Amino acid sequence: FERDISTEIYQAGSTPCNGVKGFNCYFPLQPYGFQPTNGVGYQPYRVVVL
Amino acid sequence: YSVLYNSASFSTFKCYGVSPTKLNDLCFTNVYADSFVIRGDEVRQIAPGQ
């Protein structure tokens, strides 16, 4: 039941520096798997957990 | 594989089924390293869905 949305940099161990490429910056990924009206896993299933 | 991943070059590192950092802890059999030369348009030319 924890939530993490800090959106920091995933230091890959490549170097202790602030950057994007080779740093895996940005914890979430923009390429959401929406594949509109096709494929499998096109974002069906709205979830409610009680 | 820690030196291979965290290299001075090897700008393309398309690792699947395992993280680059987890791989250097796993043990396998019959590991194959294939090698070849291609033109510059290499991007997404090696994907399983390619």
Coordinates of N, CA, C and O in Angstrom, one line a residue:
Chain A
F1 N 0.8 -1.2 0.0 CA 0.0 0.0 0.0 C 0.8 1.3 0.0 O 0.3 2.3 0.4
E2 N 2.1 1.2 -0.5 CA 2.9 2.4 -0.6 C 2.8 3.0 -2.0 O 2.5 2.3 -2.9
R3 N 3.1 4.2 -2.1 CA 3.1 4.9 -3.4 C 4.4 5.8 -3.6 O 4.8 6.5 -2.7
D4 N 5.0 5.6 -4.8 CA 6.2 6.4 -5.1 C 6.1 7.1 -6.5 O 6.0 6.4 -7.5
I5 N 6.1 8.4 -6.4 CA 6.0 9.2 -7.7 C 7.1 10.3 -7.7 O 6.8 11.3 -8.3
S6 N 8.2 10.0 -7.1 CA 9.3 11.1 -7.1 C 9.9 11.4 -8.4 O 10.4 12.5 -8.6
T7 N 9.8 10.5 -9.4 CA 10.3 10.7 -10.8 C 11.7 11.2 -10.8 O 12.0 12.3 -11.3
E8 N 12.7 10.4 -10.2 CA 14.1 10.8 -10.2 C 14.9 10.1 -11.3 O 14.3 9.8 -12.4
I9 N 16.2 9.8 -11.0 CA 17.0 9.2 -12.0 C 17.5 7.8 -11.6 O 18.0 7.7 -10.5
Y10 N 17.3 6.9 -12.5 CA 17.7 5.5 -12.2 C 19.2 5.3 -12.5 O 19.5 4.6 -13.4
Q11 N 20.0 5.7 -11.6 CA 21.4 5.5 -11.8 C 21.7 4.1 -12.1 O 21.4 3.2 -11.2
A12 N 22.2 3.8 -13.2 CA 22.4 2.4 -13.7 C 23.7 1.8 -13.2 O 24.0 0.6 -13.4
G13 N 24.5 2.6 -12.5 CA 25.8 2.3 -12.0 C 26.9 2.7 -13.0 O 28.1 2.6 -12.8
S14 N 26.4 3.2 -14.2 CA 27.3 3.6 -15.2 C 28.2 4.8 -14.8 O 29.4 4.9 -15.2
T15 N 27.6 5.7 -14.0 CA 28.4 6.8 -13.5 C 27.5 7.5 -12.4 O 26.3 7.7 -12.7
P16 N 28.0 8.0 -11.3 CA 27.4 8.8 -10.3 C 27.2 10.3 -10.7 O 27.8 11.2 -10.1
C17 N 26.4 10.5 -11.8 CA 26.2 11.8 -12.3 C 24.7 12.1 -12.6 O 23.9 11.2 -12.6
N18 N 24.4 13.3 -12.9 CA 23.1 13.7 -13.3 C 22.9 13.9 -14.8 O 23.6 14.8 -15.4
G19 N 22.1 13.1 -15.4 CA 22.0 13.1 -16.9 C 20.8 12.2 -17.3 O 20.0 11.8 -16.5
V20 N 20.7 12.0 -18.6 CA 19.5 11.2 -19.1 C 20.0 9.9 -19.8 O 19.5 8.8 -19.4
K21 N 20.8 10.0 -20.8 CA 21.3 8.8 -21.6 C 22.4 8.1 -20.8 O 23.4 8.7 -20.6
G22 N 22.2 6.8 -20.5 CA 23.1 6.1 -19.7 C 22.8 6.2 -18.3 O 23.4 5.6 -17.4
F23 N 21.8 7.0 -18.0 CA 21.3 7.3 -16.6 C 20.0 6.7 -16.3 O 19.5 6.7 -15.2
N24 N 19.3 6.4 -17.4 CA 17.9 5.9 -17.3 C 17.1 6.9 -16.5 O 16.3 6.5 -15.6
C25 N 17.2 8.2 -16.8 CA 16.4 9.2 -16.2 C 14.9 9.0 -16.4 O 14.5 8.7 -17.6
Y26 N 14.1 9.3 -15.4 CA 12.6 9.3 -15.5 C 12.1 7.9 -15.2 O 12.1 7.0 -16.1
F27 N 11.7 7.7 -14.0 CA 11.2 6.4 -13.5 C 10.1 5.7 -14.2 O 10.1 4.5 -14.4
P28 N 9.0 6.4 -14.6 CA 7.9 5.9 -15.4 C 8.4 6.0 -16.9 O 9.4 6.6 -17.2
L29 N 7.6 5.4 -17.8 CA 7.9 5.4 -19.2 C 6.7 6.0 -20.0 O 5.6 5.5 -19.8
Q30 N 7.0 6.9 -20.8 CA 5.9 7.6 -21.7 C 5.2 6.7 -22.7 O 4.0 6.9 -23.0
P31 N 5.9 5.7 -23.3 CA 5.3 4.7 -24.2 C 4.4 3.8 -23.5 O 4.6 2.6 -23.4
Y32 N 3.2 4.3 -23.1 CA 2.2 3.5 -22.5 C 1.7 2.5 -23.5 O 1.4 2.9 -24.6
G33 N 1.4 1.3 -23.0 CA 1.0 0.2 -23.9 C -0.5 0.3 -24.3 O -1.3 -0.6 -24.0
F34 N -0.9 1.4 -25.0 CA -2.3 1.6 -25.3 C -2.7 0.9 -26.6 O -3.9 0.6 -26.7
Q35 N -1.8 0.6 -27.5 CA -2.2 0.0 -28.8 C -3.7 -0.1 -29.0 O -4.3 -1.1 -28.8
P36 N -4.3 1.1 -29.4 CA -5.7 1.3 -29.5 C -6.4 0.3 -30.3 O -5.9 -0.1 -31.4
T37 N -7.5 -0.2 -29.8 CA -8.3 -1.3 -30.4 C -7.5 -2.4 -31.2 O -8.0 -2.8 -32.2
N38 N -6.4 -2.8 -30.6 CA -5.7 -4.0 -31.2 C -4.8 -4.6 -30.2 O -4.6 -4.2 -29.1
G39 N -4.1 -5.7 -30.6 CA -3.1 -6.4 -29.8 C -3.7 -7.0 -28.6 O -4.9 -7.3 -28.5
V40 N -2.8 -7.2 -27.6 CA -3.2 -7.8 -26.3 C -2.6 -6.9 -25.2 O -1.5 -6.5 -25.3
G41 N -3.5 -6.6 -24.2 CA -3.0 -5.7 -23.2 C -3.0 -4.3 -23.7 O -2.0 -3.5 -23.5
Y42 N -4.1 -3.9 -24.3 CA -4.3 -2.6 -24.8 C -4.9 -1.6 -23.8 O -5.7 -0.7 -24.2
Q43 N -4.6 -1.9 -22.5 CA -5.1 -1.1 -21.4 C -6.6 -1.4 -21.0 O -7.3 -0.4 -20.6
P44 N -7.2 -2.6 -21.2 CA -8.4 -3.0 -20.6 C -8.1 -3.2 -19.1 O -7.0 -3.5 -18.7
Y45 N -9.2 -3.3 -18.3 CA -9.2 -3.7 -16.9 C -8.9 -2.5 -16.0 O -7.8 -2.3 -15.5
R46 N -10.0 -1.7 -15.7 CA -9.9 -0.7 -14.7 C -9.9 -1.4 -13.4 O -10.7 -2.4 -13.2
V47 N -9.0 -1.1 -12.5 CA -8.9 -1.9 -11.2 C -9.3 -1.1 -10.0 O -8.8 0.0 -9.7
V48 N -10.2 -1.8 -9.2 CA -10.5 -1.3 -7.9 C -10.2 -2.4 -6.8 O -10.7 -3.5 -6.9
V49 N -9.3 -2.0 -5.9 CA -9.0 -3.0 -4.9 C -9.6 -2.6 -3.6 O -9.3 -1.5 -3.0
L50 N -10.4 -3.5 -3.0 CA -11.1 -3.2 -1.8 C -10.4 -3.8 -0.6 O -10.2 -5.1 -0.6
Chain B
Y1 N 29.9 -9.4 -16.9 CA 29.0 -8.6 -17.7 C 28.9 -7.2 -17.1 O 28.2 -6.4 -17.6
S2 N 29.6 -6.9 -16.0 CA 29.5 -5.6 -15.4 C 30.3 -4.6 -16.1 O 30.0 -3.5 -16.3
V3 N 31.4 -5.1 -16.7 CA 32.4 -4.3 -17.5 C 31.8 -4.1 -18.9 O 32.1 -3.1 -19.5
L4 N 31.1 -5.1 -19.4 CA 30.5 -5.0 -20.7 C 29.4 -4.0 -20.7 O 29.3 -3.1 -21.6
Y5 N 28.5 -4.0 -19.7 CA 27.4 -3.1 -19.6 C 27.9 -1.7 -19.3 O 27.6 -0.7 -20.0
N6 N 28.7 -1.5 -18.3 CA 29.2 -0.2 -17.9 C 30.5 0.1 -18.7 O 31.6 0.2 -18.1
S7 N 30.4 0.2 -20.0 CA 31.5 0.3 -20.9 C 31.7 1.8 -21.3 O 31.0 2.7 -21.0
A8 N 32.8 2.0 -22.1 CA 33.1 3.3 -22.6 C 32.3 3.6 -23.9 O 32.2 4.7 -24.3
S9 N 31.7 2.5 -24.4 CA 31.0 2.6 -25.7 C 29.7 1.8 -25.6 O 28.9 1.9 -24.7
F10 N 29.6 0.8 -26.5 CA 28.5 -0.1 -26.6 C 27.2 0.7 -26.3 O 26.4 0.3 -25.4
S11 N 26.9 1.7 -27.1 CA 25.8 2.6 -26.9 C 24.4 1.8 -27.0 O 23.5 2.2 -26.3
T12 N 24.4 0.8 -27.8 CA 23.2 0.0 -27.8 C 23.3 -1.3 -27.0 O 24.2 -2.1 -27.2
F13 N 22.5 -1.4 -26.0 CA 22.5 -2.5 -25.1 C 21.1 -3.1 -24.8 O 20.5 -2.8 -23.8
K14 N 20.6 -3.8 -25.8 CA 19.2 -4.2 -25.7 C 19.0 -5.5 -25.0 O 19.1 -6.6 -25.6
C15 N 18.9 -5.4 -23.7 CA 18.9 -6.6 -22.8 C 17.5 -6.9 -22.4 O 16.7 -6.1 -21.9
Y16 N 17.1 -8.2 -22.6 CA 15.7 -8.7 -22.4 C 15.7 -9.9 -21.5 O 16.5 -10.8 -21.6
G17 N 14.7 -10.0 -20.7 CA 14.4 -11.2 -19.8 C 15.2 -11.1 -18.5 O 14.9 -11.9 -17.6
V18 N 16.1 -10.2 -18.5 CA 16.9 -10.0 -17.3 C 17.5 -8.6 -17.3 O 17.8 -8.0 -18.4
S19 N 17.7 -7.9 -16.2 CA 18.3 -6.6 -16.2 C 19.8 -6.8 -16.4 O 20.4 -7.8 -16.1
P20 N 20.5 -5.8 -17.0 CA 21.9 -5.7 -17.2 C 22.7 -6.0 -15.9 O 23.8 -6.5 -16.0
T21 N 22.2 -5.6 -14.8 CA 22.8 -5.8 -13.5 C 22.6 -7.1 -12.8 O 23.3 -7.6 -12.0
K22 N 21.4 -7.7 -13.2 CA 21.1 -9.0 -12.6 C 21.8 -10.1 -13.4 O 22.1 -11.2 -12.9
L23 N 22.0 -9.9 -14.7 CA 22.7 -10.9 -15.5 C 24.0 -11.3 -15.0 O 24.4 -12.5 -15.0
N24 N 24.8 -10.4 -14.4 CA 26.1 -10.7 -13.9 C 26.0 -11.3 -12.5 O 26.7 -10.8 -11.6
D25 N 25.1 -12.3 -12.4 CA 24.9 -13.0 -11.1 C 24.3 -14.3 -11.4 O 24.2 -15.2 -10.6
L26 N 23.8 -14.5 -12.7 CA 23.1 -15.7 -13.1 C 24.1 -16.7 -13.8 O 25.1 -16.3 -14.3
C27 N 23.7 -17.9 -13.7 CA 24.6 -19.0 -14.3 C 23.8 -19.7 -15.4 O 22.6 -20.0 -15.3
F28 N 24.5 -20.0 -16.5 CA 23.8 -20.6 -17.7 C 24.7 -21.8 -18.3 O 25.8 -22.0 -17.9
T29 N 24.0 -22.4 -19.3 CA 24.7 -23.4 -20.1 C 24.7 -23.0 -21.6 O 23.8 -22.3 -22.0
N30 N 25.7 -23.5 -22.3 CA 25.7 -23.3 -23.8 C 25.4 -21.8 -24.2 O 24.4 -21.6 -24.9
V31 N 26.1 -20.9 -23.6 CA 25.9 -19.5 -23.9 C 26.5 -19.2 -25.3 O 27.6 -19.5 -25.6
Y32 N 25.7 -18.5 -26.2 CA 26.2 -18.2 -27.5 C 26.4 -16.8 -27.7 O 25.5 -16.0 -27.5
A33 N 27.5 -16.4 -28.3 CA 27.8 -15.0 -28.6 C 28.0 -14.9 -30.1 O 29.0 -15.3 -30.7
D34 N 26.9 -14.4 -30.8 CA 27.0 -14.3 -32.2 C 27.5 -12.9 -32.6 O 27.4 -12.0 -31.9
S35 N 28.2 -12.9 -33.8 CA 28.7 -11.6 -34.2 C 28.6 -11.3 -35.7 O 28.8 -12.2 -36.6
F36 N 28.3 -10.1 -36.1 CA 28.1 -9.7 -37.5 C 28.2 -8.2 -37.7 O 28.0 -7.4 -36.7
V37 N 28.3 -7.8 -38.9 CA 28.4 -6.3 -39.3 C 27.2 -5.9 -40.2 O 26.9 -6.6 -41.2
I38 N 26.6 -4.8 -39.8 CA 25.4 -4.3 -40.5 C 25.6 -2.8 -40.8 O 26.4 -2.1 -40.2
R39 N 24.7 -2.3 -41.6 CA 24.6 -0.8 -41.9 C 24.0 -0.1 -40.7 O 23.5 -0.7 -39.8
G40 N 24.2 1.2 -40.8 CA 23.8 2.1 -39.7 C 22.3 2.0 -39.2 O 22.0 2.1 -38.0
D41 N 21.4 1.6 -40.1 CA 20.0 1.4 -39.6 C 19.9 0.1 -38.9 O 19.4 -0.9 -39.4
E42 N 20.4 0.1 -37.7 CA 20.3 -1.1 -36.8 C 19.2 -1.0 -35.8 O 18.9 -2.0 -35.1
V43 N 18.6 0.1 -35.7 CA 17.6 0.4 -34.6 C 16.4 -0.4 -34.8 O 15.7 -0.4 -35.8
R44 N 16.1 -1.2 -33.7 CA 14.9 -2.1 -33.7 C 15.0 -3.1 -34.9 O 13.9 -3.5 -35.4
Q45 N 16.2 -3.5 -35.3 CA 16.3 -4.5 -36.4 C 16.6 -5.9 -35.8 O 16.8 -6.8 -36.6
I46 N 16.7 -5.9 -34.5 CA 17.0 -7.2 -33.8 C 15.9 -7.6 -32.9 O 16.1 -8.6 -32.2
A47 N 14.8 -6.9 -32.8 CA 13.7 -7.2 -31.9 C 13.0 -8.5 -32.3 O 12.9 -8.8 -33.5
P48 N 12.5 -9.3 -31.4 CA 11.7 -10.5 -31.6 C 10.4 -10.2 -32.4 O 9.8 -11.1 -33.0
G49 N 10.0 -9.0 -32.4 CA 8.7 -8.5 -33.1 C 9.1 -7.8 -34.3 O 8.3 -7.0 -34.9
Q50 N 10.4 -7.8 -34.7 CA 10.9 -7.1 -35.8 C 10.5 -7.5 -37.2 O 10.4 -8.7 -37.5

